[PDB]
Amino acid sequence: PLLTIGDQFPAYQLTALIGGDLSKVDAKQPGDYFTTITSDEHPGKWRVVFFWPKDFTFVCPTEIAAFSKLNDEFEDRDAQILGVSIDSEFAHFQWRAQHNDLKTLPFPMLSDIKRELSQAAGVLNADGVADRVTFIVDPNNEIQFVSATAGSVGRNVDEVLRVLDALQS
Amino acid sequence: PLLTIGDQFPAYQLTALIGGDLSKVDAKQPGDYFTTITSDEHPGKWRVVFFWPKDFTFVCPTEIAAFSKLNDEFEDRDAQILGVSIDSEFAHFQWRAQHNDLKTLPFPMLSDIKRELSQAAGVLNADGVADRVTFIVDPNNEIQFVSATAGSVGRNVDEVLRVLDALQSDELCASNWR
Amino acid sequence: PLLTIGDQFPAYQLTALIGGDLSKVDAKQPGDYFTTITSDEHPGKWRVVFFWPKDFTFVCPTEIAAFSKLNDEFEDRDAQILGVSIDSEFAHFQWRAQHNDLKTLPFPMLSDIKRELSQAAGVLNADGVADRVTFIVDPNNEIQFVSATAGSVGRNVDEVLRVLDALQS
Amino acid sequence: PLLTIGDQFPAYQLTALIGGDLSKVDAKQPGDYFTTITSDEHPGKWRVVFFWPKDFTFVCPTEIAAFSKLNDEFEDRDAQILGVSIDSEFAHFQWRAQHNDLKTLPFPMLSDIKRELSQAAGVLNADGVADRVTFIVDPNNEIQFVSATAGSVGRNVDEVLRVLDALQSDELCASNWR
Amino acid sequence: PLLTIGDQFPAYQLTALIGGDLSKVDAKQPGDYFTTITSDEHPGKWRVVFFWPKDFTFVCPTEIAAFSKLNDEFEDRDAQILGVSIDSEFAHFQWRAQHNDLKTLPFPMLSDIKRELSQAAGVLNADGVADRVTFIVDPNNEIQFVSATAGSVGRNVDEVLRVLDALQS
Amino acid sequence: PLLTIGDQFPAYQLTALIGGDLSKVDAKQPGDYFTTITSDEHPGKWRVVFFWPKDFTFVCPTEIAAFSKLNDEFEDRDAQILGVSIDSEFAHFQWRAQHNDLKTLPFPMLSDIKRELSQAAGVLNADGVADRVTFIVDPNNEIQFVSATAGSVGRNVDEVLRVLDALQSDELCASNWR
Amino acid sequence: PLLTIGDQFPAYQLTALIGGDLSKVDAKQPGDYFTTITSDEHPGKWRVVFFWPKDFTFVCPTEIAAFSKLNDEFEDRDAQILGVSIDSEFAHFQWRAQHNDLKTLPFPMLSDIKRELSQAAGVLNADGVADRVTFIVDPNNEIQFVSATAGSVGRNVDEVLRVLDALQS
Amino acid sequence: PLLTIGDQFPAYQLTALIGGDLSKVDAKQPGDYFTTITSDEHPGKWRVVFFWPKDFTFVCPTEIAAFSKLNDEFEDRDAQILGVSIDSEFAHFQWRAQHNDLKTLPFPMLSDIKRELSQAAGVLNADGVADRVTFIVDPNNEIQFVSATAGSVGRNVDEVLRVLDALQSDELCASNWR
Amino acid sequence: PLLTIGDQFPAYQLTALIGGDLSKVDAKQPGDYFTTITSDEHPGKWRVVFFWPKDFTFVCPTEIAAFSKLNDEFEDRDAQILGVSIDSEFAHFQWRAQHNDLKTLPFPMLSDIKRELSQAAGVLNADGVADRVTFIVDPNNEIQFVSATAGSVGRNVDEVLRVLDALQS
Amino acid sequence: PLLTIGDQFPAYQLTALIGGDLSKVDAKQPGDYFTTITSDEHPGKWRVVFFWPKDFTFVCPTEIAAFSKLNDEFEDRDAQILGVSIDSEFAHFQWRAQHNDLKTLPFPMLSDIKRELSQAAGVLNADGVADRVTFIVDPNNEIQFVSATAGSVGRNVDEVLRVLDALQSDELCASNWR
Amino acid sequence: PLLTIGDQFPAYQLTALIGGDLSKVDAKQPGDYFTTITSDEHPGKWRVVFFWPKDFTFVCPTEIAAFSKLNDEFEDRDAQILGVSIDSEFAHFQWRAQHNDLKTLPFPMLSDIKRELSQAAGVLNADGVADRVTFIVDPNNEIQFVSATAGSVGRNVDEVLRVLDALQS
Secondary structure (H helix, E strand, O other): OEOOOOOEOOOOEEEEEOOOOHHHOOOOOHHHHEEEEEOOOOOOOEEEEEEOOOOOOOOOHHHHHHHHHOHHHHHOOOEEEEEEEOOOHHHHHHHHHHOOOHHHOOOOEEEOOOOHHHHHHOOEOOOOOEOEEEEEEOOOOEEEEEEEEOOOOOOOHHHHHHHHHHHHO | OEOOOOOEOOOOEEEEEOOOOOOOOOOOOHHHHEEEEEOOOOOOOEEEEEEOOOOOOOOOHHHHHHHHHOHHHHHOOOEEEEEEEOOOHHHHHHHHHHOHHHOOOOOOEEEOOOOHHHHHHOOEOOOOOEOEEEEEEOOOOEEEEEEEEOOOOOOOHHHHHHHHHHHHHOOOOHHHOO | OEOOOOOEOOOOEEEEEOOOOHHHOOOOOHHHHEEEEEOOOOOOOEEEEEEOOOOOOOOOHHHHHHHHHOHHHHHOOOEEEEEEEOOOHHHHHHHHHHOOOHHHOOOOEEEOOOOHHHHHHOOEOOOOOEOEEEEEEOOOOEEEEEEEEOOOOOOOHHHHHHHHHHHHO | OEOOOOOEOOOOEEEEEOOOOOOOOOOOOHHHHEEEEEOOOOOOOEEEEEEOOOOOOOOOHHHHHHHHHOHHHHHOOOEEEEEEEOOOHHHHHHHHHHOHHHOOOOOOEEEOOOOHHHHHHOOEOOOOOEOEEEEEEOOOOEEEEEEEEOOOOOOOHHHHHHHHHHHHHOOOOHHHOO | OEOOOOOEOOOOEEEEEOOOOHHHOOOOOHHHHEEEEEOOOOOOOEEEEEEOOOOOOOOOHHHHHHHHHOHHHHHOOOEEEEEEEOOOHHHHHHHHHHOOOHHHOOOOEEEOOOOHHHHHHOOEOOOOOEOEEEEEEOOOOEEEEEEEEOOOOOOOHHHHHHHHHHHHO | OEOOOOOEOOOOEEEEEOOOOOOOOOOOOHHHHEEEEEOOOOOOOEEEEEEOOOOOOOOOHHHHHHHHHOHHHHHOOOEEEEEEEOOOHHHHHHHHHHOHHHOOOOOOEEEOOOOHHHHHHOOEOOOOOEOEEEEEEOOOOEEEEEEEEOOOOOOOHHHHHHHHHHHHHOOOOHHHOO | OOOOOOOEOOOOEEEEEOOOOHHHOOOOOHHHHEEEEEOOOOOOOEEEEEEOOOOOOOOOHHHHHHHHHOHHHHHOOOEEEEEEEOOOHHHHHHHHHHOOOHHHOOOOEEEOOOOHHHHHHOOEOOOOOEOEEEEEEOOOOEEEEEEEEOOOOOOOHHHHHHHHHHHHO | OEOOOOOEOOOOEEEEEOOOOOOOOOOOOHHHHEEEEEOOOOOOOEEEEEEOOOOOOOOOHHHHHHHHHOHHHHHOOOEEEEEEEOOOHHHHHHHHHHOHHHOOOOOOEEEOOOOHHHHHHOOEOOOOOEOEEEEEEOOOOEEEEEEEEOOOOOOOHHHHHHHHHHHHHOOOOHHHOO | OEOOOOOEOOOOEEEEEOOOOHHHOOOOOHHHHEEEEEOOOOOOOEEEEEEOOOOOOOOOHHHHHHHHHOHHHHHOOOEEEEEEEOOOHHHHHHHHHHOOOHHHOOOOEEEOOOOHHHHHHOOEOOOOOEOEEEEEEOOOOEEEEEEEEOOOOOOOHHHHHHHHHHHHO | OEOOOOOEOOOOEEEEEOOOOOOOOOOOOHHHHEEEEEOOOOOOOEEEEEEOOOOOOOOOHHHHHHHHHOHHHHHOOOEEEEEEEOOOHHHHHHHHHHOHHHOOOOOOEEEOOOOHHHHHHOOEOOOOOEOEEEEEEOOOOEEEEEEEEOOOOOOOHHHHHHHHHHHHHOOOOHHHOO | OEOOOOOEOOOOEEEEEOOOOHHHOOOOOHHHHEEEEEOOOOOOOEEEEEEOOOOOOOOOHHHHHHHHHOHHHHHOOOEEEEEEEOOOHHHHHHHHHHOOOHHHOOOOEEEOOOOHHHHHHOOEOOOOOEOEEEEEEOOOOEEEEEEEEOOOOOOOHHHHHHHHHHHHO
């Protein structure tokens, strides 16, 4: 049972790898790459939440490119993109530090390491990992879009932008 | 709580308005426009199930034209499109007889008049009608795609076709489509 | 179990297509054709409530004519006619906008879309729709007449007028 | 809560005053005016069941004359009219023996003296008597028409006949009658 | 189980046909023949209560005569005679209006139409009607005599007078 | 709560003082004045059962004389009279041996010493003794008449005989008796 | 289970035939032969209670004589003799009025007509009557002697006097 | 509550990253780097099971070199080393493909992705990951050694080897080792 | 179920043989060799707790030597070593008094004679004795290390020092 | 609540230190000093069971010498002496190897290390050890003597022998002993 | 289950034959030989309690002699000897009055006639009598010695003195 339209998106408080070029961050401690992100953190913004099963699985260069080009377009619409898997924050870091496409990913990656958000959202599947699910959550914390896909169907980020746009009009 | 990836789609047995030009069907009796459609009616086919809230409501004219320039691409892929709302079969008929864009809609429209299928799929909303939701269900009756939208955001039918195609082919890239 | 004589008619709050010539209404928004109607809405009037199964089924031209000619006769008797089916208000609109007989129907059509009134009244049947049932409800909210018919037995509107008359004397 | 369309009419077994001129029946014993009438007594017939509150109460003289100019039209349609109140069979007798308009009433009057049938049909009211209600019940014992009225609104028997006729014939129009 | 000696007679509130010559009553409305009678209605009087099964069954001319001749004798003893069956008040009226013997019955006939008094007294039988039962109830509402008979055994009204007399001494 | 019309009279099995002149019975043993009387003792007979509160209490001399000028009329009608109180059989004996009016009483007096029959019939009162009650019970053990009186109102035995006679004959009129 | 030594004798309130020569009592009403006797009635006296099964059974002339001769002896010892059976008071009266030996019985005979005392004392037997039982009850209401016999074993009144004497010393 | 000496180690069935140089395995399909490893996979062998919290975390370079200069000493003793964390098999792969010190790690790394084994062993901690724990389990599946450490205290693998050796040989002295 | 990392070490109050050279203690009473030791007794110190099954079993001379040489090293790290078995304090005394190696054991030996500490810690085994288990407990009473071994595997005291060091850094 | 006269002594199965000079036993393996002793080990013998709180505690040197000048008198009487404390078998060994007075103790010392026998006999005290108690149990496992003392009151073993002797012989007099 | 070391000895309140030469007591009433003895009766004394099964069974002359010679020895140690059986006090009296050895028994014999003390102490056996059991009870009411014997094993009174001595030191 996936949370649907009209449902409150779950509360969360999770460690996250920061967005943006990791080589551009200073480096006084490992903790500098990392941050806590909670559901109370941009009051009045839309949140576009991407779940996926496992770090280190094939992603399309075009899909990662689409995130960078479409970044201003999401920001202009008061929408904060957030990625979530149950991988640890060090797995997130390692994925973004070693795969040239992922180097400049502009948004944070949350580590749902106790699996509490995936569970509460209805996305935790039979393999023990989040399904590939996108949610759009409005400023009242209400889901206005959910999309779930099996297997390894690529995300169409432009379509999720289209929906956000149409939701705000 | 929507049904999700890996769930069995619910069983059903609903009066449907037949697909195709209703002007081509011989008017020998009224019941010629209608059949009973059950969940076992399409063996071996993927089922692409679209719910909408109410007949007689604004639908973007190019979304309709997509459901009919595209219906062939779905069949080629052994997929059966089925539309569902809570309206009666007579409201479906009337919509497809007098909305010009729908005059040639090639698939059946199920009448979920007892609300049983919308309810079992997790789709019936607080106003008593189906949310705008799409399911792709495989030949073993398993959900492989579900998408839901608030309000009056229109469907991108070509996106649904892409997903269907990616599910059957293990294409990994949204940009490799068309 | 149908509600009977002496029973309180259920409370309701439903969207309704307004009565009267739809071509005579202005048109600044779609919502102009529509209204909310509640059970608290004509204090001191009798209500004559017609349920039917489905919009877009055969109605007799003579039956629709009888509504227009008998309209003054119901109004003169402080009786508000109300129609109810579980169809949506847009189905009601479409039925009245496209069938020349229905164009000038002088009373509102309520959309019992969650099926709550039909259920509470005892008229929701095994097909999931309201039976063909007429109620006459007095100003104390008490049923003084109920008539229920199977199948496609035409309504005799003149008989329901006769009964109302006899009830008031 | 009245029984409604689609419900089974209740079983019953009640002493009835026989129909017809009571002056024509041979007075060999008092019990000659009476029989037991059960719900299986009329196989293959539609049953038109009229309840009223009390014998000896004002009935419009033309309603009675309708129940006897019309009783033939009902029989022609394989319908059996049965009257029911809570009065005893002896009160029915007395009403039909000394009210001139009722001297020739052609159908039986059931005595629901234990109140069991009125109660099971949903017809017994807060004063302890039957509401003014009419049922049409088909040969499979299923209710196809129920009508109830407060107070002392008289029955339109010709309307009941119309409904009976429309139920058997699929006439859709009240104005096509007579 | 019939109520017996020492038992409180049940409370009642029932519509009744008035006693006496019905042709001697004026006639401004039907309701003029009728009255409500309750158990609180002659404080300090004895009540002699007659139940019977059904109006319109054979009664002996001699038994009805005995009521008229013995009337002063009951009144002289502060005893109010009351008749009860489950027939309606209009059945009572019709019985007394059409049977020449009954025309001048000097006491009221109560309509136990919901069958509550017969039930509470223990007289309601398996046919659904009151048995033929006489009670004598003293001014404290206490039963001092009960007599119940099957079938169509005629009442001996003189014997009930004898008993009342002996009870008062 | 007295047992009433249509009820089964209770089963019983009680020591009785024999009916008839006790001076005629041979005094070979004391037990010659007594038998056990059960409720199956009188097959085919109606039973007329009189309860009274206490032996040795004022009984009107003409009521007794009625129970013995009338006992033949009861037998002629296949009726067995049985008297019952809660006193012992020895108190019955003593009453019938030394009250002159009772010296020739022709029926048995049952001793309900455990109070079981009075209790089961609904006759035992708040003082612990039988109310003054009469039952007529038919050959199928069914109550057809019950009469109860407060205090020291004496029985009209001829009235009981009348009722017995009317029950067996369908005489409708109290005035047609004697 | 008979009440024994140390047990409280039951409370009672019963109608009784008075003791003494019945022909010596005046006679203004039947009630003159009779009285109520309760357990609260001689404060500070011993009570010698005799139960028996049935009035009108053989008693020995010698046993009745012993009561009259031993009467002063019981009174001198502040002991009140009381007889009890379940017979009615009119049976007691009749027994004492008609049997020449019993004419001058100096003590009261209680009528345990509801069988409550016999029951509470443990003397009510399987035939429904009191066993032949003697109790001696002291001024504190405590049983100091009980004797129970089957069948028709004659009472030895002199022995009960002996015991009372020895109990008081 | 850790499982302890004498307890049965839990059953398991987990995807593992294969041991050895991943550069030597033929890249015919991705699944060639992985197998399913069950708790019955190593009959007759002692199992040396190391849990750690997270891949990609600082591990002392000489501890790793111990797990590969020492892995032979373990095999000689019929012991199978198995590593376990909650990371996916793809995170194990990535760690062993790009951390140079791990390029040649000779034993399998189990993916406890459902957390079931960590939970059953008593090892899953309040942060949702495995505590740093070592078990030695004998050929009858019985725990003969368990060691747990807070924080980022590194393992002394040679100590574990010593214990393994002492368990199989009844050496009583830690100082008789090497 | 052994207590693990993060768990509170159990409270205890046990009789103990004092640490150090027993021949160097005076001797005014037997009780002089003995003391009570409780869990509240060095506030702010680390505690290194050694359990073993049975006094009088083989211990390595080298292991006992390691305790004396490493003693300053534990003290320098604010760590109090404590030994525990379920043996009585007189068994502890006798073991240390008669085995030349044990003569100078610098730490106390607790007698867990009711087996309450071993039970509460999870170390009491199927033979009824403590397993060979080492715990390191920090100043907040939190376990930061546990090690349990079957059979007769010698302790490596230097390794436990290594761990303590690394825990404190 | 001690077990008492007439009670069954508890079943047991405990490691014991063997009786006799431990210097005479061949030191081929450590287990040569020990056996398992069960409650069925001594069929046909009376069992004289002494509990004490702790090994290594002051025992009066003449009480010990009594347990060895007297052990023959017990055997002559088909009695087996068994000592019990909660100490381990290794503490018993050590006590009997290095306390000179105990070097030649001729009976077994049971190790009640799980505390099960002390508990079942009612002997385990609030300090967790056995009270100083003696039982004499006959060949049918029935208790014929139990004696318990607080504190450090020493046993009079000759008294126990007297009781044993009086139980087997029906001597009535304590003064007829020795 | 016999009460043991550390247990509270039961409370008691029992009739007792006094100790000492019975021929030396005056004799104004039978009650002079007798007394009530309770557990509250020598505050601060030790109590040495002897139970036995039945009065009138063989006791050794030497055992009775030992009581007289050892009497000062028990008194000097603030110890009160008490004997208990379930025999009545008159049985105790009769035993001591008729058996020349018992004539001068210096201590009281309690009559545990309701068997409450024997029961509460755990000494009441399967024959319904007290086992042969000695208890030594200290001034805090705590049992410090219990000895129980089957059959007819003679008591060694000197041994019980030895134990008392050793308990007090």
